[model samples]
Target chain A: AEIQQINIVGNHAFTTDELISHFQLRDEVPWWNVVGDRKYQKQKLAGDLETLRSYYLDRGYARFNIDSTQVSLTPDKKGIYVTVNITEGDQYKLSGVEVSGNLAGHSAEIEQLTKIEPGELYNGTKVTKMEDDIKKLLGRYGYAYPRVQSMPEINDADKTVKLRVNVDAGNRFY
Target chain B: MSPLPTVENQFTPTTAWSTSVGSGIGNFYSNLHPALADNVVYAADRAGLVKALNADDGKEIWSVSLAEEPALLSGGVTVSGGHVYIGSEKAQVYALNTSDGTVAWQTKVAGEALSRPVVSDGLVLIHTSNGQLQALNEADGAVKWTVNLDMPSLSLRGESAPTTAFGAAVVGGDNGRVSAVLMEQGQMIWQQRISIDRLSDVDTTPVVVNGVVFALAYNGNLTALDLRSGQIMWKRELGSVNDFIVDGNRIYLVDQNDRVMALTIDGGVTLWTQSDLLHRLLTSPVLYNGNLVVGDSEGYLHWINVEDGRFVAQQKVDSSGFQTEPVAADGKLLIQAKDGTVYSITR
Candidate 1:
């Protein structure tokens, strides 16, 4: 069913226009539009909702949560509206970071690759990118099988996130 | 002492990215700490070199050479007001634009500003090795105000950065006193003796929290004073030059013998102490997650529980050892080895 409107409530810092700009599925096309990808597709809504979650988290909201999302149809059975409820938690900064296990002796080089520190905004992509970068660095050093895991220690009251990255650079290629 | 107990491992961090600046700093008695602003990291070395890099990536943006001789760039680094500030061994302070590593202004101070500069109220504050605190204009690097204190013949090897509190600058003096002065005109608000022992030198920077100034003397006493009236809130015989971290209700420190201890903030009551790192030359203490983290001269970073003082994790960050405390920000912990390696370790 095509969505007639999007009701994005409980958003404080992020506006609705910014939220809707990220969506591929749009409300029912108005007569003002000639060419449009605005028609609501069932599958795109699933993806767009996940993106909304990431968008909030990447911007320092460690406890950003989605409360309820209701897709209600009009009584005439012609249009629909997506009512999304969200709660923006406190903005979090990186508190401290530590790592354990085999570093393949490239501690400094690997540290450089992470590119994220403890005093910046909490970001999911940065964390994942750091883990991926570590894997890439280990690969360059001939470690074919590497296990790099990231565990986040979040302090809700203080609004800080701590990361503990575990690395196991398996046997080298040589 | 008992053998090093087994610790259930917890944290495992991956290095994000790193590149060499000039030479290593931790190995020397140099006052150099990296500064970060607008996602840019400004760092310097003992050899008259300062460089800027992306905080998210180790890509070099610009590099500048301030001196032609060795051991010229000895002071710390501070970033503020579209400029990066650093001190030199030759009584010089250089202010460079953050965009391009270009020298905006360079001025001479009365003493070697051997500690990281603190910028407050449009002034650059640097505490020097000669028992003085000089405030420079952030725009042109001109000397704004200077406050001189007693210079002790015997003191710690390094000078701590100036601590700011309640519209004033708090300086840990080499004369066993911690002085308070207005950041505006450099007038003394009050000066109190925190240490009165045989070797009385307050080397650790006084940490001010909630109108209370906590100053610890090197082998003297840890005294808490009211920031305004300069009255003693509490005093304890405990002291350390390695620095201390005061969380909400507890204070953590590595004492004279390098024993890591936790004490209550209310009355300076001792809670729990860990002696495994005694005499290990620990590099102060930092907080990681809910545990207390400290690196040692033996090239080991130890994680101890803050509740009862139990070792929870340990790792050799560098075999060359760590002389500088690990810098933490944005959920990341970074430590530089004496051999000049900077590792970004996190959990």
Candidate 2:
């Protein structure tokens, strides 16, 4: 079904237009519309939900929640409307960070590549940046494919978060 | 996805001979075009095996290995002044003597020479991927002069071969500009902008024909400039990253959508446009005899009539397709497939 209207509720940190930009099933533009024959897919909707969650997580909204999503079909069966209800919780601050991995004996160098710090807003963008930086640092040491993951520990009572970064350096090219 | 449609063969070419050169490192971006010189044909695989074959019978004349370790070869082969030249992604350029396939000299450049080097005026000019052009002494393989350029933030995947003629070397840059430098002193002659978009790239070799230089930007613009003064004579919006062929007064190009077009050289007037072979991802256009020949991504060589831009013939050499331009020499057209098979076709 063609998407006729989209409404985002309870988002005080950003406007509805900002959240809608993260969706893939947008209202079609006339000139640049190449997906006229495309039908609605459930997998794409799930991916858009993940994208919306990531947007909130990147902005320090560690406890944000999605209440529900309502999909209503019109009487003519030609169009559908989507309504996403969300709850914006309190933002959290970063309390601490730790790093560990098979860094090829260059743990100090890898530790210096982290972008997150203590006592700052719990920004998921900074954590993701640290993952990429660690990967590139491992790559220079001949690691063809390195895996880095930053896991967050949320303290609900204190409204704080802690991160632990783990790395798995794969086979060396050299 | 639907099954690929197989069309009926309209015409068949006379195959002079075919040979398996060797195996190359099979990748999505490998290039191994067959180079022709006099009566000998030269080619190199991604594994660094350079071979020379006889143009008539496909007999092997020589074989040499330029690498001791497994390395990938990006640049194609070039033959000039009794020497065969090629560049590797290992950041080295090799110069082999044409007679015995023995290495005369080799030199390391600043970056990868991902395209064929142009030789003129006693110098071998190699354009590098890091936006530097190095002029080396053709005899001794010593670096003579180097000029640095600023590359665009987004550019095409291919590189341009410097066009050398009349004591000057002309080359296109990723910054959508064509530059001319004096071959004797490495001084800038002039630079003309063909595109203003930040993503537009001038990645194909500039064709200098009859005192006029013709080049194309990746954003679908073709510009003709005067060779002496760097003045823009005319511009047309035609998308192509392939080196266009200028024959007599007609220019032939394979556009971005795999359409073959013929235009007048004087006014850039469109003579004909053929869209029968659309969406084929064709290589550059090569004029063999009186036909415009192009290879597609499926190893099929499509021949179009030069007079009316109609299909004349098609031949399949390999299922792995082709990534390099077809070359014509000694009344024979040579094609190199992606799987390292070389074929010589004659009328």
Candidate 3:
């Protein structure tokens, strides 16, 4: 190969093929990167690595770390080699979800609004989306300054999580 | 449909004069403002050069430099009792004669006063950043009383100036509490927690209008509390680090989001919100005539009509923008820009 492709070693959650697919993915991906030719440009490669890092973080790899990278030249002097080292921690999963605080008798409906399943892998975007929807729902009812928070209790020992979706419907003035 | 672009539109300001004090505040986080007294204005720079300027024309009356490395004039200028009072980064307070910028008295305080000194009843109130509110004698620079407040280890870069109401000194605490200390005895009249969170700070000075106190925090609430009882009357889930002012029945404040709002004093009703300058890193709004004038990060001054939330007019006062509120009085407005230029505008 004229340009040595990327080798993302020490990653178990994502395979080499799946990880490299992000190199030419959508413009508005999980993180910041340059949407360019699949061929390696030094700065563009640096950005591509962050796309993978952002993907891992959004997937609840709270302790995800990019260990190191080693770039070298080929013996033929016309090619480049890139080695990205990453340490993706355990992908935490959701165990339970509930709602609390000033429910105003809509506890069951609000709990269902979280849309977080007990067995699915935890996603930061999902948790934030749940908060946004609940906050908007309260604001629709004349609660001018509603606050919706997802208080997560993460147990690293068992890789379990419990979230309390707290809703505080502040003063009812538009 | 989309909103139209902003370009001066309505509120145009006529600059009376513009002058410089020195090298400017220089990359430091400062709320220091030019203090106005009678027909004279006093201002300082980060290099400790304090000067007096004629309030009408932008001519310098006198200038004096302090001896210190870096000469950080963190605490702003305060004018009262025939003296110009200012504080420095080295925990020192200077009281200079108003006629000439000569040092009359100087004292070493226990901490740096981040806010301006308040002169009341023959005493000067200095609220330091380290959570100590001390009252010094007016005639001499001697420590008269010190009331220590519980402070957070970390906070936003500002402090509430000590305000006087009912013969007591009221100041917002860094730990999100407001305390009323009796000025003479230094006894705590009442201390009430209004903001709830780790690192929550009531950085805004409490504005006392009528008999109620409007106190706001960085991430908590804009609360209306009873002045005597320190009991909460009502609260709105709004926060602001910039100081608000009350001249009549309405309170004008710039929220944390840089939105200028006018609220009713009785119910804290959001009467109008001018969001044209959203996310512009705005300074506090100063009232001039029937309009509100505020400066933004781009060195532009915006004027919004208080009757309704409309961009009545705006103009660029300086290229350095502003980091503090302007002073309005005697049909004139004084604004200090980040570039160390002081501008006086006619309403």
Candidate 4:
């Protein structure tokens, strides 16, 4: 479907243009879609919604929720219009971190790349980076596809969080 | 009835000698034209095998594998000042002593040295795929100066080496323009937009003949410009990326469609166009003994008459196909196949 308009609502940390750029939708003129604007694909919209959720989650909006996403066809049957509504919860701060698992005796090396800290903003990007670092740390020891994850413990009263990293080197060894 | 000999009939199979250079590892991008210097043929393959052979009989004089590990030898070979200079895909240039095939000096460049290095006036000019023309000192492989150009995001898979004349090094760009830079300072003297279409790629090396430089754009334009000022003298719609042979008043070129054409060097007028070998993926035309010689993707060499552009002779030397243009010297020509086999053709 041809994209006519995109409406991003309830986003305070970023502007509408920023969210639109995050999606695959192209800008259109008042009367028509631009020359190279791609038609709206349903699967792309689903993926874009996940990307939007991840954007909020990575920015410490752990309780971010999508209220509704509405897609409607225009009256002339020429284009589609999309509206996304979101609820951004309170931003959390990192309280502490813990790393313990089969890191191939490289737990201390993984701890050196500490992104999450006390009194710092809880960044999902940093958490994902820590997971990748742990995977790479195990990869050096011939452990390919290491199961690494991060679990966050939230304190509702203090609005702070603590992260526990879990690493399990699977049977798949390089 | 049996076929006639190649020297008597143009399309007949004639054999001088054919030999394998070596096996290669990965895919090769640069054309592997053998260099003829001092009556000896110097050739290399993507597998890092550099060989110097007798040009008369194709006997192996001396051979040296340039790199130990898996390495690609591109930019062909440049023999000058008692050193055989060759570049590799690993961003390195090696200078070997021509007397003993020993390494004289090796240095690193900024990018892939996929184009042939031009040696002139104690400097080795290397044009890289990343839009940098580096000049190295001939005595010791020291980088003297570098000239950079804008690289297009998408381009055809080829690079043309720079042509040097009149104290200037003329380089073609992927952006469909040609620039002339001073050899002394590596400073740009002038840049001329040769192709009308911006997406055209000037992948053919510019040939400076009698104060006029001829360059072909891949999108369909053969232009003649003044070598000193980079001013366009004349241009004709002739699409080709392969290097053309400039003989006397006529220039022989294989088109993008693999059809060979002969044009006047001065006015860019087509004298004759040969379409018998269409879709063959013909290599650049080389003028050998009053005939236009070119190889095809099927590893067959076709000799066309210089006067009428007719097929004079053809020979199937290898089935692996020929990638580089044939180099001729001392009454013999050499061709390298895609699988890294070298063949010597003598009449």
Is candidate 2 or 4 superior in lDDT?
2
User: What TM-score does candidate 1 reach?
Assistant: 0.63
Off by over 4 Å in 3: A1-174, B1-8
Q: How do the residues B211-263 of candidate 3 rate in per-residue lDDT, one tens digit apiece?
A: 78889987778998899989999998888788887767888888877778889
Question: For model 2, how does the per-residue alpha-carbon lDDT over B1-347 read when each residue is reduced to its tens digit?
Answer: 11233545566686788777677534335345888998899987887888899989888999888766434566778899998988765557788999998988888875656668888889998886666788888898998888776665335555678898799989888788889989887888998888723456677889899899999877757889999988999998986777888888998998766779999999789999988767777888898878999888777788888888877777766787776888987788998877777889876
Query: Each predicted model: what fraction of the native A–B Cα contacts (within 8 Å) does it retain?
Result: 0.00, 0.00, 0.00, 0.00
Per-model C-alpha lDDT, please?
A: 0.75, 0.77, 0.76, 0.76
Docking class of 3: incorrect
DockQ of each: 0.00, 0.02, 0.01, 0.02
Tens digits of per-residue lDDT for model 3, A1-174: 133445564577887668877764221233455444334455676787778877886787756788655443321123444546667888788887888888656666676786655478777677878888777777777877878788778788978767767788778884
Cα error, candidate 3, residue B196 (Å): 12
lDDT of model 3 at position B72: 64
Would you list the clashing residue pairs of candidate 2?
B220-B239
What tens digits encode model 1's per-residue C-alpha lDDT throughout A1-174?
Answer: 456556465576887768977877776454766676445565787888888988987888878888655453321133555546677888999876677789979988887775555379988777777888888889998998899898878998778998888999989998
Can you give the lDDT of residue A97 in candidate 2? Answer: 76
Model 2, runs deviating above 4 Å: A1-174, B1-11, B196-198
The candidate, 2 or 3, that scores higher on DockQ is: 2
